[model samples]
Target: GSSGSSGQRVYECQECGKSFRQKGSLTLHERIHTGSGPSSG
Candidate 1:
């Protein structure tokens, strides 16, 4: 059926050493390292 699922690759974060099945997830995780976000009061 050619679902294009077997070609999927795993990605890992260099900073936190985390792994993900999708590349988008890895990019989002990297934002955490920038130290730019809201903080709790």
Candidate 2:
């Protein structure tokens, strides 16, 4: 389940435990875990 905040929802990664402000944002973020997006630099 995603965490809820002021007018927004926070999604957390099960692997890294990182939090996001939106479900879409979190979904995009999850791609990083699978090497689908840019790396954290």
Candidate 3:
């Protein structure tokens, strides 16, 4: 948890090392696994 939520390990990404406080957001982040976009700058 962080910010407004406070503190806790809510969600963890299976693909990359990214962690999300919300599973919904983590699921959304799953798109990265498809390699749809390589987080290129």
Best by TM-score: 1
> Against the unseen true structure, what C-alpha lDDT does each candidate score?
0.79, 0.72, 0.73
TM-score, candidate 3, is 0.48
Residue-wise C-alpha lDDT for candidate 3, range 1-41, written one tens digit per residue: 45486755657875567777777988888776686555867
Model 1 spans with C-alpha error above 4 angstroms: 1-9, 35-41
Tell me the deviation in Å of residue 17 in model 2: 1.2
Cα displacement (angstroms), candidate 3, residue 31, comes to: 0.9
TM per candidate: 0.54, 0.49, 0.48
Error of 1 at 31 (Å): 0.8
lDDT, residue 29, model 2: 75
Model 3 ranges with Cα > 4 A deviation: 1-9, 35-41
Task: Tell me model 2's lDDT, rounded to 2 decimals.
Answer: 0.72
Alpha-carbon lDDT of model 3: 0.73
Q: Compared to the true structure, candidate 2 yields what TM-score?
A: 0.49
The sequence of per-residue lDDT tens digits that candidate 1 reaches over residues 1-41 is 37655554478987779998888999888878885567884
Q: lDDT winner among the candidates? A: 1
Model 3 lDDT, residue 6, Cα: 72
Full candidate order by lDDT, most accurate first: 1, 3, 2
